[PDB]
Paper text:
A second dataset of the Lig1−DNA−PCNA complex reconstituted in the presence of excess ATP yielded two 3D classes. The second class (Class 2), termed “open conformer”, yielded an interpretable map at 4.2 Å resolution. Compared to the complex reconstituted without ATP, the open conformer is characterized by a different orientation of the DBD relative to PCNA, lack of density for the OBD, and poor definition of the AdD and DNA. The open conformer shows that nicked DNA can associate to the Lig1-PCNA complex in a partially bent conformation. The map quality, however did not allow a definitive modeling of the AdD and DNA, thus only the coordinates for the DBD and PCNA have been deposited in the PDB. In addition, the structure may be the product of multiple turnovers of the ligation reaction, whereby the released adenylated DNA may have rebound adenylated Lig1, and therefore its assignment to a functional state across the reaction is not possible. In addition, the open conformer shows that nicked DNA can associate to the Lig1−PCNA complex in a partially bent conformation, with the nick ends set apart. While the role of the open conformer remains unclear, it may facilitate the handoff of the DNA from FEN1 in Okazaki fragment maturation (further discussed below), or to a repair enzyme in case the nick ends are damaged and not ligatable. While the details of the handover mechanism are unknown, it is possible that Lig1 captures the nicked DNA in a partially bent conformation, analogous to that observed in the open conformer of the Lig1−DNA−PCNA complex reported here, where the flexible OBD would make the AdD-DBD subcomplex accessible for DNA transfer. A rotation of the DBD relative to PCNA would then straighten the DNA and poise it to be encircled by the OBD in the last step of nick sealing.
During lagging strand synthesis, DNA Ligase 1 (Lig1) cooperates with the sliding clamp PCNA to seal the nicks between Okazaki fragments generated by Pol δ and Flap endonuclease 1 (FEN1). Lig1 comprises an unstructured N-terminal region (residues 1–262) and three folded domains (DNA binding domain, DBD; Adenylation domain, AdD; and OB-fold domain, OBD). We present several cryo-EM structures combined with functional assays, showing that human Lig1 recruits PCNA to nicked DNA using two PCNA-interacting motifs (PIPs) located at its disordered N-terminus (PIPN-term) and DNA binding domain (PIPDBD). Once Lig1 and PCNA assemble as two-stack rings encircling DNA, PIPN-term is released from PCNA and only PIPDBD is required for ligation to facilitate the substrate handoff from FEN1.
Author numbering:
A (entry chain A): 266 to 338, 350 to 412, 420 to 506, 512 to 523, 528 to 533
B (entry chain G): 1 to 185, 193 to 255
C (entry chain E): 1 to 186, 191 to 255
D (entry chain F): 1 to 107, 109 to 185, 191 to 255
Write the structure that this text describes.
């Protein structure tokens, strides 16, 4: 699953079926693809492709995926839970945690090394986000062991960064608020399946599209997002005040 | 109404002491042939497979097929009351969620009883992969226990291999590296089809090897790209298997 | 002037090893009859009384009814250094506030001796009124220690029951429920009971687990109680005297 | 091409356990005549001497003088994996930074571990020998008992010698006491006298020196006026273990 392709399509390039819960693997794969491109506009276009696909299949799922993206709701507990869930020994893996990067690269490399048993159920974004609110000692290490064992390919790094509270994806809350503004602009809510709209800016000039997106972004920033999102999908400057 | 009676309280104690640290909650299957346990570990890396067949039991009764579970820690805590030669009685009800243990001394002057609580679960299961193995060794229990307890101070993984000369464990670590070789002969015996290399995590081998006092011998059998088995045969009543998934 | 000697020198190690965990200060009262020691717990829940007959000592002489008080944990630590087979001599002056202890090896090749700080203790005395009981129990000390440890894994209080056939130790708790029944055995492995009415009481299991620290003092414990009065556990040390721990019934 | 073989692995284990905490780093003086080790403790209070005579090794093969460096904690951790009756052999190549320790069963099981060295430029200081004025030789068990016993009263011991017997004395917050010994087969003390001495010592370091009692049935205490104590352990024909400690003023 990739959103980096030029002229990517929120309909035919989705990673899940309609009426299926949103998977975290596409979210993690996006976060690492963003980390590989330094362009803020190319990052914003990638997030707009994600959000546009999310509103096209699962309109209720937008609050969690945004809350994760903004990280809005200790390292020794993390390393203990990684050691307990990944085998080896807490003291031996603690040497591996030195000289290398963050705990996430030890975690993902360990989950790469053990060929493991059967594949567990893929973690859904709503399940992940619900688990994080409950996570905020024995209770903590038990639930964090359940996150780490479920990691399917590369999600472990972004799970660890989320627990460390230092996601540092290269964007901020206003950047994703603008990403949502062009997401809702290119694909409005309240569509009847199949959605006849996929790119509302088609036939606008480059300057017209830049001005239109900036004016839509200006309405978002002026308008708690937990009541902003349900009003945006249900309908804005009069509906909220 | 389910009932089981056993003179060897030592073996029931030894089995729970082999499991109490690896599995917290476990599902028992109880049938005319015997009791079964077939559980995963919390990290989902090791499969524990147990079988206690009824012909070795001193008395057995299973009118109704029952599939109860219990938490192993609180059962281990209750079981430390029994003396080494005590007669152990297990009984349960097919309608209620409780298990009664009654402990009888060898001489009849003292009797102990214990109501452990019970619950129902449907823990995910996966079937036994019956297959041939290219590799198999029979070697005494204490040697494998020594080997794991020794290599666990050097490294983190054991790289197992087999040759026309014998077997070789090897491990590497921050303080150094080492290997141990056994030559082909209370003895060691090998049936060998083609050499192979693997890798395993010592944490689970240390957890398994607490079963040592159940049998004087063990069988390691394995093949390329599949789980390895560690087998302990109980004296004329059943067997215990462990599985571990290979690293890569 | 006061002095005493004992050939079986391990029993003093034992009686202080049982008491170090229960109390921290006590009055060693001394008189022509022998040693007397009564006290109350650090939490006023248990009464201890200890006596030693002077005629059980191998050598004794008392000319004044002294009273003295000592830190108990300090005397348990001073006595811990002595060898289990050695000979103990205890000496004290009527005026000088200091204890003298000697530890004679059996072959006299090593002489150990130590002296310790007395302090003036204001601990009260509460002489127990004397009465009969509804029941008396004699049974092996190593078995009572076993059952009291075994119940301690279930839950925080025991209810102890008596019947004409025997005795019932019963406990509930989080893990479950259990009870243990004992009945008469047809000299040191034979239990015995005598009774005039059946009884049913409750006790704080922690305090019994503290009390059973003295299991190596005697092969036989004596368990006894009556309606609403304190539980008495008594130990007969080898011909010397007796040790008893009291606990009023929990409510 | 260094080769050494010893049929009593229990000696090598015991001596390495006697050093497991007292010393962090040490250098081995490998030469044609055997093995030697001098080192000082982690707080620079006490010197130790270890000597391993080449005659105590059932096959010995050395080529040139070699110093080597290994951390005693890790070498001890490896040695705690050998069987207490195995044949042990040490092997290394004069150029490489790796020590091979091979163990062999009394009958099929070959186990070998390679320990990585580290370079050091450490100084070695000896001590002059002199004719001690008061020496005691006494059973190792009685010495461990007395040093454990008196440490419960206080961190200070005083010792004095007399014509019949040496006396160990201590005092603390909670009381005071002393142990008398007298001249009296291995269970017998021997005392020789030249002039009366009275010195004080630190219990903690005597406890740390006393960890090697299973090496020898009996021990020798060497002391005199104004000089460091010597505690002496002699191994069965192999060599000796010796410890040094100066008095408090």
């Amino acid at each position: 699953y990739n959103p980096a392709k030029n002229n990517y399509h929120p309909v035919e390039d989705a990673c899940w079926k309609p009426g299926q819960k949103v998977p975290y693997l596409a979210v993690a794969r996006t976060f690492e693809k963003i980390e590989e491109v330094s362009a803020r506009l190319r990052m914003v276009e990638t997030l707009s492709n994600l959000l546009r696909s999310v509103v096209a299949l699962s309109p209720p799922d937008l609050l969690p995926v945004l809350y994760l993206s903004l990280n809005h709701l200790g390292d020794g507990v993390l390393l203990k839970a990684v050691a307990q869930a990944t085998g080896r020994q807490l003291e031996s893996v603690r040497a591996e945690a030195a000289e290398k990067g963050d705990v996430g690269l030890v975690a993902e490399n360990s989950r790469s090394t053990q060929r493991l048993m059967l594949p567990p159920p893929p973690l859904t974004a709503s399940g992940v986000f619900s688990k994080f609110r409950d996570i905020a000692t024995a209770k903590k290490i038990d639930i964090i062991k359940g996150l780490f064992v479920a990691c399917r390919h590369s999600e472990a790094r972004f799970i660890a960064r989320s627990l460390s509270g230092r996601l540092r994806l290269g964007l901020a809350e206003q950047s994703v608020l603008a990403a949502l503004s062009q997401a809702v602009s290119l694909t409005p809510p309240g569509q009847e399946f199949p959605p006849a709209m996929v790119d509302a800016g088609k036939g606008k000039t480059a300057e017209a599209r830049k001005t239109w997106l900036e004016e839509q972004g200006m309405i978002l920033k002026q308008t708690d997002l937990d009541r902003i999102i349900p009003v945006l999908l249900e309908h804005l400057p009069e509906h909220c005040k | 109404m389910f009932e089981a009676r056993l003179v060897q309280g030592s073996i029931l104690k030894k089995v729970l002491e082999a499991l109490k640290d690896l599995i917290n909650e476990a599902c028992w299957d109880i049938s005319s042939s015997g009791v079964n346990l077939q559980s995963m570990d919390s990290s989902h890396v090791s499969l524990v497979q147990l079988t206690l067949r009824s012909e070795g039991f001193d008395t057995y009764r299973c009118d109704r097929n029952l599939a109860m579970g219990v938490n192993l820690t609180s059962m281990s805590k209750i079981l430390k009351c029994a003396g080494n030669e005590d007669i152990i009685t297990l009984r349960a009800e097919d309608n209620a969620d409780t298990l009664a243990l009654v402990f009888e001394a060898p001489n009849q002057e003292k009797v102990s009883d214990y109501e452990m609580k019970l619950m129902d679960l449907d823990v995910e299961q996966l079937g036994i992969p019956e297959q041939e193995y290219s590799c198999v060794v029979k070697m005494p229990s204490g040697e494998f226990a020594r080997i794991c307890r020794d290599l666990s101070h050097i490294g983190d993984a054991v790289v197992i291999s087999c040759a026309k000369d014998g077997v070789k464990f090897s491990a590497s670590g921050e303080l150094g590296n080492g290997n141990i070789k056994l030559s082909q002969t209370e003895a060691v015996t090998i049936e060998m089809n083609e050499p192979v290399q693997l890798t395993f995590a010592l944490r689970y081998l240390n957890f398994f090897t607490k079963a040592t006092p159940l049998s004087s011998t063990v069988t390691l059998s394995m093949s390329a790209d599949v789980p390895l088995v560690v087998e302990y045969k109980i004296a004329d009543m059943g067997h215990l298997k462990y599985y571990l998934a290979p690293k890569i």
